[PDB]
A paper describes a structure:
The icosahedral capsid contains 60 copies of a protomeric unit composed of four proteins, VP1-4. The binding of such receptors can trigger pocket factor release and viral expansion, leading to externalization of the N-terminus of VP1 followed by VP4 to form a pore in the endo/lysosome membrane through which the genome is thought to be subsequently released. Here, we have determined three cryo-EM structures following mixing of CV-A10 Kowalik strain with KRM1: the CV-A10 mature virus, a disassembly intermediate A-particle and the mature virus in complex with KRM1.
This structure lies underneath the VP2 helices that abut at the twofold axes, in a similar position to, but eight residues longer than, the corresponding helix found in EV-A71 and CV-A16. Internally, the N-terminal portion of VP4 is disordered in CV-A10 Kowalik, but residues 18–28 are observed to cross to an adjacent biological protomer in strain SJZ10-1740T/HeB/CHN/201014.
Residue numbers in the entry:
A (entry chain B): 10 to 255
B (entry chain C), C (entry chain C): 1 to 240
D (entry chain C): 145 to 192
E (entry chain C): 1 to 48
F (entry chain A): 2 to 297
G (entry chain A): 51 to 149
H (entry chain A): 150 to 199
I (entry chain D), J (entry chain D): 28 to 68
The structure:
Amino acid sequence: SDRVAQLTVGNSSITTQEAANIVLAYGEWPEYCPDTDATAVDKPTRPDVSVNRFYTLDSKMWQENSTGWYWKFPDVLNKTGVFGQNAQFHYLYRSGFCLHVQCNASKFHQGALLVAVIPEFVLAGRGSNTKPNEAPHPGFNTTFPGTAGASFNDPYVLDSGVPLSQSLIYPHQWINLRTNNCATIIVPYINAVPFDSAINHSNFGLIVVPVSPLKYSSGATTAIPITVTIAPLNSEFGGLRQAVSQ
Amino acid sequence: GLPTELRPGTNQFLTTEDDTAAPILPGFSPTPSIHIPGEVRSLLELCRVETILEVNNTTDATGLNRLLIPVSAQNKADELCAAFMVDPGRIGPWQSTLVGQICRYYTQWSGSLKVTFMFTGSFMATGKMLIAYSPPGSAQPANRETAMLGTHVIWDFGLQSSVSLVIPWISNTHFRTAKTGGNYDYYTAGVVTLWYQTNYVVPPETPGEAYIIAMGAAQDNFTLKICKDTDEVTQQAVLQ
Amino acid sequence: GLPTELRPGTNQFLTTEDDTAAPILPGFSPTPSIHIPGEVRSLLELCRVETILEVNNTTDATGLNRLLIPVSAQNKADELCAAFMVDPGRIGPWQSTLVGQICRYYTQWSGSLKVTFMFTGSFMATGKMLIAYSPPGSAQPANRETAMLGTHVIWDFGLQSSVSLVIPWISNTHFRTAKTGGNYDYYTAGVVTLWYQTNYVVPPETPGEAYIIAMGAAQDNFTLKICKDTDEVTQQAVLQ
Amino acid sequence: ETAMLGTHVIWDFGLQSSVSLVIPWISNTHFRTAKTGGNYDYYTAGVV
Amino acid sequence: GLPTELRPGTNQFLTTEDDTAAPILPGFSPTPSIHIPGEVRSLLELCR
Amino acid sequence: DPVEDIIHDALSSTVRRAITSGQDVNTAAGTAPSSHRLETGRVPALQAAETGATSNATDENMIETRCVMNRNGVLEATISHFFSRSGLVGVVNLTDGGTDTTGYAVWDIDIMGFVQLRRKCEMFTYMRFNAEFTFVTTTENGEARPFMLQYMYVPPGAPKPTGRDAFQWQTATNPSVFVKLTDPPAQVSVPFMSPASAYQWFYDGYPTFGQHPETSNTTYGQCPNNMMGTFAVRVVSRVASQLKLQTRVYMKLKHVRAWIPRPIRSQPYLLKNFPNYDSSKITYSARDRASIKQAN
Amino acid sequence: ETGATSNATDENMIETRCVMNRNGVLEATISHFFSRSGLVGVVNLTDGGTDTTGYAVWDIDIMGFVQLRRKCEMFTYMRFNAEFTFVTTTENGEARPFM
Amino acid sequence: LQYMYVPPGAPKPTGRDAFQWQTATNPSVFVKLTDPPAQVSVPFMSPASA
Amino acid sequence: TNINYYKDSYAASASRQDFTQDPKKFTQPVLDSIRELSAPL
Amino acid sequence: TNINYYKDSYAASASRQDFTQDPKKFTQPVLDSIRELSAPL
Ligand SMILES: CCCCCCCCCCCCC/C=C/[C@H](O)[C@H](N)CO
Ligand SMILES: CCCCCCCCCCCCC/C=C/[C@H](O)[C@H](N)CO
């Protein structure tokens, strides 16, 4: 009665049989920018069916010695669908997201994933150089991975200095292969400005860390993939001009 | 006496403090005021006034010709006529107008702007222009098929020789700083380009070289933030 | 003028004083605030949130394996699985959680705590555990017949893979300090031990090694006293 | 990644072993003919 | 500012003065008091 | 009316109720007595951390408790009283000697230079507040000597001073503080001066468009809505006064509002603007023990 | 050519939304524009043995330093009350108890 | 001079110019040697009731 | 509620701050009021 | 009854201290309210 669940957005739907809950980040739904908070004078555009739907990224294979992955939003949806085109043609972007991560496994596999969102997930350069002119900084592809998504190098510190233990203060959810098989999170627009660019600043990042490593006996299925799907909700765009990829 | 305690901040002289000061002349009665027309109460009355824009600020363009963008009969269509960035705090054309010289006394500006284009050509000479303001992103467009996508207005010549394109307030933050360059270009406002919509058609025995006067001003929702020392004046020694 | 008298305490700068200060910008109107979700008003909202506990903080346990206590099929019954002291101000497991890193900014803490144990084993693997919090006194128990006397809960595996043992507020004084060691152990809070209630029974072709995630948090009657400089950060020179 | 753009549903296994995807009526004309091939492919309905 | 005048007695520290002093910990709430028997309010209870 | 799929949602997209109402909590929560309950189906101990919600198993539902009219205070835990204590922010070194023929010092306003306050104000992602600055100024030995000093605030855009007696020090518009070295520290109040709606200490993005390199990505994360100008200091004189001077700045955060909490940093700091660390020396948050089942 | 500035506002040119603009305009009034003190004049009193004058004299004229002159010359007729503040140091910037 | 209050638990200074003197949280009193004595008020800070 | 400690009015601090704009005397100083949406000439 | 001697609001000392908690947005940020004494799943 509470394990089964169906989400539906636009022309897409998602079923699930073992996930039990919907984590609403910070207890607020995605809403449109009210007039008392808007700064842009122009009229934005609100498709609400061309962009508000479930885009399914590629799958990442969970290995016995994996280290975790991260995505940036709305970086992933900048080349796919009408969302990608609107974000490439418009300067001001605003939207909440609905994340849904699936990693199914038999009742004999064991493991646990931590699926969290990090508002303003600033990455860090791993290096002991203390002068700001020779210090290492993460490359562009390492900080804005894109639809492919990037992997961690040392997830215990989330590649951002902060420990992973306290990362549970963020809107998070576990994928425990004994109880649930997918985790979902509805996150609103989290930013210090009414609108913002969609190709320069990524509002937040998604984190999938295999805390309890995958373990199974011989003969079971070795290829355990993880699939993420994202639905931008209550999206607005403004400031139309020629297409700028980045 | 009354017990008091002196806190940090004593004996300091804050140049912007709002406090009283002992008068020198007790029982003083100044010269009565009369009615002098043209009283200004806030600098936002000054930002709304149109002032000419040094948009032809190129070398080998000395004198008053900086205030004139040329217009001529083009043999090639879709051709660019002029362009300039719409950042009043930036150096360039806006550095000459009033809004652009008074927006430098404050740090952050907000609100829309407007740019009036007055045609100073002959009466028999007609034409059409396309004035396109492109919000931030890439650099200025290459062709006008790319510029037509931004905010724009198609200006027809004839009577009422001046059109006015309003640069709306399209931004993320409520305010933009006057400083640009470096990582302050995050506060850039885009570029406005003037393209030849069709041409500059002219009958015989009429000059094929005309000029356009660009004037800039602030809209009615213009506002400013923290004061600041301007950077347009320099002094070495006292003026003796 | 008005007769006054200066008392001791003048011209001093108390870093924690609550007083006014002359503004630099008169007639200032800041950028209006918007609605940013997730506003926090007091740090007690942060102490209630569960955060993982570095309870496997042993040498030769590098990496993320510090957050995992192992569980395996024991051939000997009544066997101990894990243990740790319940003093958040103390160094150890609590040093990683949020309540334990924010209880170091204050000196004295009060209120109950809770510890959630999530099982990350297979679905077919069952078992029972005994989580026993022993108030102060002797050191940790030797056998579980001694631990069963303290506060405890018997956790069964299956669906709802996480139990939560609440460490009540059992103390003499209304507050305990964050510092321990020396004669400050008078403020110790006891030890919590996790024993194998029965076993970790597992069917064939299922791994016999599972893990348990320990998370810690503060209860609803948690409160804190005088602020304090944390001792978890060190700096030699300015960060240039 | 190209198919996810159309109408779709993500089916999870477990109890209730059958899902049902509804192919909506997305067309220009009110009716489609049964014949296909040649210039009758103008009445094609897509692929699942 | 308000015109004042400093009188003799400034900057002195009278050990028996009855005056205020800037607190170090703002928004402080001490440990609540309990009932401890045998409260003495004046030394004349001790002389008897 | 003619087409109603457009009206059915326009009049349905109002403010959606997201009830999470808080209440005014003056003191810590008490407790209510509880007897033993031998009942099936009602289990407050069994939780599920996979729901992303923290356990709600309170004391009364687990063990038999008494009642206590808890009178403890919670006021010292509010972020207002948490950031209400001033701390060191930046220190400038003005060497107005004969060999240093500069005469003035300049400090880019950046509170991320000293870990003590950075570690606190970085546990929250978006902060909006008013600051209370206090300038103590001594010599290199810690002595005070009656030399008048001028602190000028140079907002972003204004011309920075170029000499001890340059014209920029006229401060016709820039706010400025003239104070003697033998006076109480100079204290002023500064408002929320960001162009945005809140300061953000972490800005996962770039300031400008364009191609971003992969070797030296020195521009990542640097948000301009944080940089609030510059602080210049000089000694009011025409010729050099041979002394080494040191000005320390302390800031108090009042009328604070914080948003989107953040894990408190564990690894040491290495850079001011960037949250760098070193993968070679990962300092684990928990000290090491001998064994796991040997709580010390 | 009418001498009047354009009145084409935003709503009449492009399709705009509505915004309850809460920005402030108080820091643009001339009151708060000139409410900040600035340098006006500096006198040099060399009371040495070679300069047997002992006093200095300054003709009150604020048009000597550009910083404030450039501001107060953007208006042609001004009427105001001034608040003067005299800082006095030595040539090195030292204070010494001389009345 | 700088007087710092180090409650039980905080790191005690280790040098004249060590980082502990940043007093980001610890209360501190900066006062000159030629000023009136520094006076503050401290509450009942014991964890017990007396 | 600001106050002045001296009996001379020119010793007060910021007696009255006002919000009074009148741009129509610099932006539209014309005789016959031009409408906002009509042709000027 | 605290007071501010300047007409600028950002010069006051501690204008208003508040007791307003809302942990249910960090501790229980879920869609369907879980009961305190029932089984979660
Ligand atoms: C004459 C007075 C000079 C002192 C006043 C200088 C103005 C102070 C402005 C402070 C701006 C807010 C506090 C600064 C925050 C962080 O440093 C920045 N966001 C970047 O680190
Ligand atoms: C004992 C007090 C001495 C200081 C007071 C001197 C009187 C100041 C009179 C100021 C007169 C109005 C301000 C001066 C304006 C311009 O300098 C003049 N219009 C010419 O430049």
